Scaffold this active site. Structure first.
Site, PDB file in Angstrom:
ATOM      1  CB  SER A 126     -15.598  42.069  26.639  1.00  0.00           C
ATOM      2  OG  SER A 126     -16.770  41.762  27.360  1.00  0.00           O
TER       3      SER A 126
ATOM      4  CE  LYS B 207     -25.135  45.096  23.682  1.00  0.00           C
ATOM      5  NZ  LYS B 207     -24.279  46.277  23.362  1.00  0.00           N
ATOM      6  CG  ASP B 208     -25.877  35.201  23.756  1.00  0.00           C
ATOM      7  OD1 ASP B 208     -25.206  34.526  22.952  1.00  0.00           O
ATOM      8  OD2 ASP B 208     -26.201  34.786  24.885  1.00  0.00           O
ATOM      9  CB  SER B 209     -20.542  37.457  23.528  1.00  0.00           C
ATOM     10  OG  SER B 209     -20.727  38.819  23.182  1.00  0.00           O
TER      11      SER B 209
END
Lengths: 274, 274, 274, 274
Positions: free
Chosen positions: D44, D159-161
């Site tokens: 992103s 993976k975590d945002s």
């Protein structure tokens, strides 16, 4: 038939943030003047949850003893005891109907909202209008309304302030000769009447006849009703919307009548112009 | 001055859905048993808005008379007159602290919310804790909290149930000797102690002691504290969170203590297993 | 002057989720039959972002080459490079109009959105309709559309699928003789025409003439159009909305023409009762 | 074996908004010279959807050819053809891992999202980390992450945002020796490592070593590392968050390295200081 125009009354306040009954009387006179069909004290516009059970009782008493107009009393609260108390008292002093939204603060599913309405409506008898206003409280689905409608002839309509036209058309589907459906957003009344709404619950009528003109212009004069909607009502709403709800309604009223009206915190004066 | 574990007390009800002053006793001696540091009647877990001002005054009186551990009274209400009367009552009967969240129902900006805390704090002395619970009411921004803090020494800290970690860390920046910062989600207590939290306001303590064991284990055994969070508290929060808040919290306290406990609409029985 | 009924075309797929150009023809010939006025390939209904730039160029070519209906090409993409390419390509093969919604994925304010339309409109003279669909991408405010309107004559209208009636009326306030305003939700067409909409972009036209009858009936028989909307379109729109968008549209088209059609993931077969 | 700090590289641009391969080499060197563990092109932060398939391919090839650091290729796209193409391509040129978030634009339930990952993981072989970023795309539930993990051994982690700590803890429960879990928010790295996170994907490493210092100081002196989170990473994140993401990361890289870098709309220069 419940129908025509309901004024969700402001609760005019003196400069100490307490109820101004002379201003309330002034407001009632004005509403009778422009021929609203119902008075609706202690709605959202009247900011009922800023007032104590006592003040709301006092205010309801005054409004009935100062107009012969039919009254839909706001009996909202998240405490079922307060709702029943306010409903008995409205019934015991000659108020024609009650208006009730879902309880608030804690977020609720439909079963929870259903159970609450069930208990209240079996404990009571007076004409009640359900009131969906999902901006300030838990939403009540059209289906939940439908089912409450079936079990209780005391339920005489629904008021919707959602501004969701699709949601509104679902509520409309519940309309028949003994179930009114009211539009609670003044700028959407014209469109709503086309869809067969019983009428509107419009706060501008605290200080403008625009919504009433529109409605008595409707049955005959479509394009005039739309003109009044597009030219007088919508701009007025657009101006009111610039401000923290509902303090601009209060200021407009205070100014139009030359009153030193006040504001109970969390209300405050916002600085609107006419 | 303010630190450790707070129990946001459930408000036990009989089967008619009115207050069970005997279960309340059962509950108090349970909380003295496991050694929570403060009692917090009439918070969100106590479902305060479902009660009348009278009922809430009686319950505050009763918890006062029946316990010696310090009390934080929940004085929440969108009506300022109600908050002032609940804080005055609380002072006069020797409740140490008032808890106050922003006004609800109508959506408020930060100036309205501030004008409200300010008018209330201007007429009150007692230790007050600000309560941010943006799921159930209007959020109060950390900056607003900061501005109130500078203006009023009787603000003794802030509680956050937002579960927003970034936001919580912002509230923590306000921490000093005379300003506590409490985590209102039991499952996050561990993560919060590591960031400088004064403690937790943890509803599970109404029928479990995980959160306390966790807190005292924390000082010189972090991974024991983490273990208790991960293995005991967090699963218990998972089972509880399946259901309409806070009903499972009631049914569980009821099962644990063998009480024929009831539910006031919009509360209803959920069917949780112990 | 753009007005009338626009079909946001599905992109028919074989059992392997690639474009079935034979079915695309079956569809084009159905659209011509019920006399829609515009073909809109690669809109949201056409799930354009599931396809490659190459597949999309190819599809616009097929549609342009197998119909003499005026075409509005969906030239959507978050890459300003793909838009310029897709617009240049559709200008050079004689597609009358482009349709562009704001960039997606990353959340954008109005300055970013403005500058993005700015750069694009500065490089492409062709007719373009702005597309507002805040469900799927960043919203474009009415103000921002007004601004672009005056700065580029190439902007010939705006399409709105928000289903927000107030928002739509703001867009309608931009209406004039070289600026169209289309309602993107089939059940809202009648209300939108009443308020001055230039017409609709309606996915149900892929397999139903309901919307088109409505538009033509509206002229001389107002109540009749409304009846079509209430008994035909709206109940169909409800059926289609019980399912993950837009998969039901595809099944409905497949079953009707007895085609063995497929679904490119994340699309998947649903079950609709046609 | 996936562990440590990943840079979600910016895709540096020249004044005309095209990829600057000189500046990209400057970046790679800098990242090697603060010893980040992995390079993540076309995440992103690299604003992957503003680029064509061909630019994206060329950019992954470049980063492959110009550093011996292990690479995680961003393979994101709502089009499954572009994902199969980018994945097959990354494996062909020796990129170790692919990174894929759920498809966007159209709102997707979990079953759609599942059929999409399923298909892609059925058709490709290389190491694949799932990327949860619900702010910019459809969320993928832990349960869905979980199921995929069991069906496909090539799924190597997540993976975590989201910035949701509760939700991240749910993802961590899926952790094991061949299932990594990365924290995507720079300021949440410390909190995430205490809970057992494999590491962090951190865009401040495009131009600051703070996160890399943090992660190496941690294992051996926690309190030294949390001082870094507080005085270096969090205030840096405070500043960067003032602005429309991810533009400030670009301006910042451009100023530090004194590069006359640009912005591909809808990106734009935001005017950020040091």
């Amino acid at each position: 038939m419940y129908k025509g125009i309901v004024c969700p009354m402001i609760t005019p306040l003196d400069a100490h943030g307490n109820i101004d009954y002379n201003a309330t009387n002034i407001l009632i006179k004005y509403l009778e003047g422009i021929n609203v069909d119902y008075l609706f004290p202690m709605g959202s516009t009247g900011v009922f949850p800023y007032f104590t059970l006592k003040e709301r009782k006092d205010f309801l008493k005054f409004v009935r003893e100062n107009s012969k107009k039919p009254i839909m009393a706001g009996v909202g609260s998240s405490s079922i005891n307060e709702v029943n108390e306010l409903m008995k008292f409205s019934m015991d002093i000659g108020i024609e109907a009650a208006v009730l939204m879902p309880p608030y603060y804690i977020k609720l599913n439909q079963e929870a909202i259903y159970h609450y309405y069930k208990e209240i409506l079996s404990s009571n008898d007076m004409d009640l209008l359900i009131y969906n206003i999902p901006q300030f409280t838990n939403k009540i689905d059209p289906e939940t309304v439908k089912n409450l409608k079936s079990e209780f002839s005391s339920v005489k309509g629904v008021k919707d302030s959602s501004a969701d036209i699709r949601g509104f058309m679902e509520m409309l589907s519940l309309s028949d000769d003994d179930f009114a459906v009211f539009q609670g957003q003044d700028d959407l009344l014209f469109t709503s009447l086309e869809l067969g709404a019983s009428g509107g619950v419009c706060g501008t009528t605290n200080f403008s006849d625009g919504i009433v003109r529109l409605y008595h212009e409707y049955k005959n004069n479509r394009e005039m009703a739309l003109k009044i909607e597009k030219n007088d009502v919508i701009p007025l709403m657009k101006k009111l919307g610039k401000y923290q709800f509902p303090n601009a309604y209060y200021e407009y009223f205070y100014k139009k009548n030359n009153i030193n009206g006040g504001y109970r915190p969390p209300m405050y004066r916002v600085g609107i112009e006419i």
